[PDB]
Amino acid sequence: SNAVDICNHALLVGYGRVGSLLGEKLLASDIPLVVIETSRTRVDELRERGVRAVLGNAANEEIMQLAHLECAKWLILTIPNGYEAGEIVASARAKNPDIEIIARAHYDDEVAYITERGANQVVMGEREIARTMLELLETP
Amino acid sequence: VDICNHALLVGYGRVGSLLGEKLLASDIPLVVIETSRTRVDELRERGVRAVLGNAANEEIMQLAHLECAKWLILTIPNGYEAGEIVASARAKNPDIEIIARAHYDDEVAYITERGANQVVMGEREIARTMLELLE
Ligand SMILES: Nc1ncnc2c1ncn2[C@@H]1O[C@H](COP(=O)(O)O)[C@@H](O)[C@H]1O
Ligand SMILES: Nc1ncnc2c1ncn2[C@@H]1O[C@H](COP(=O)(O)O)[C@@H](O)[C@H]1O
Ligand SMILES: [Mg+2]
After folding, report:
1. Helix (H), strand (E) at residue B110
2. What is the assigned CATH class of domain A1-140?
3. What cystine linkages occur within this chain (chain A)?
4. How far is the CA of A139 from the CAs of A42, A77, B37, B74, B77, in angstroms?
5. Residue A3: is it exposed, middle or buried by C-beta count within 10 angstroms (0-12/13-18/19+)?
6. Which of A80, A139, B37, B53 shows its CA 20 to 30 Å from the CA of A121?
7. CATH (one of 2.40.110.10, 3.30.310.180, 3.40.50.300, 3.40.50.720) for B1-135
8. Which helix (H) or strand (E) holds A103?
9. Mind giving me the DSSP string for B41-89?
């Protein structure tokens, strides 16, 4: 079907370095999870493991419908390009003011672009690197 | 070249600049190595010690007093490049605390194997932070 029936779920875009770590934790926490991936290999792996996964690009409206964006509680973007992410965020937000949207970025101008398009939270890798390094340096 | 027991920070871009500003605010003695002439000039204009060159170059490390530094902090994105720098530094300064940036699991393992005390992988920290926002 390439389709899901579930609602009130975390809709996770990407299952690479970032998404796989979120996925594994979300699954442990019994938060209903649907993953969208462009990678056939990753979708096949996820399905083999009993995780709901929709194959396709999250920028495609039919793919979002297949993944039940309309009734998801969270939209979590873990793709690396912040402009691409911003476009997805814009489209999701237009259709639902309430959905919690979290996205990845790597540059300040991406953060701004994504935030302007309605994300609740943007997580910038390089800021988290600096913050975590400072935490290590400040530890006795 | 007048300084010891300092933080020796390699890179002053998105990561290094955020870290360096906090270190300066905390009165931690600091030396920055950068390949960017522009970044070196900006730092020196503010009275921050900075050495222009590649951190893999021995003479450059020497100008930055690696041999008597307290921490070596690598904030460059290329993990395998960082691992070689880590190895060279660890040979020259057996006691130095070494922290480095990485973006892939192969780099984390490698940089550790080459002698780093700590590795921070950006993509891992993105996932950690998102989970905190979630759970
Ligand atoms: N527009 C998109 N729709 C669905 N998956 C994507 C899209 N863009 C990137 N990805 C996936 O996101 C993951 C990002 O991996 P990483 O950078 O390792 O966290 C990769 O596995 C890509 O296949
Ligand atoms: N081998 C190196 N030695 C000194 N500086 C470096 C080296 N490799 C990269 N850089 C600098 O590290 C910074 C990385 O920037 P960012 O990825 O924005 O944190 C840049 O400003 C580069 O000029
Ligand atoms: Mg690589």
Report:
1. helix B105-113
2. alpha beta
3. none
4. 38, 32, 33, 18, 24
5. exposed
6. A139
7. 3.40.50.720
8. strand A100-105
9. HHHHHTT-EEEES-TTSHHHHHHTTGGG-SEEEE--S-HHHHHHHHHHH
Identify the experimental approach: X-ray
Strands A74-77 and B118-121: unpaired
Q: Encoding tokens for residue B85?
A: 């720098």
* Residues with Cβ within 8 Å of residue A136, at least 6 apart in sequence: B99, B118, B120
User: 3-state DSSP call for residue A72?
Assistant: coil
Q: Where are the domains of chain A?
A: 1-140
Resolution in Å, one decimal place: 1.8
Q: Which residues line ligand 1 (CB under 6 A)?
A: A 13-19, 36-39, 42, 57-59, 78-80; B 123
* B15 close to A (CB below 8 A): yes
Tokens 């780093």 label which residue? Answer: B116
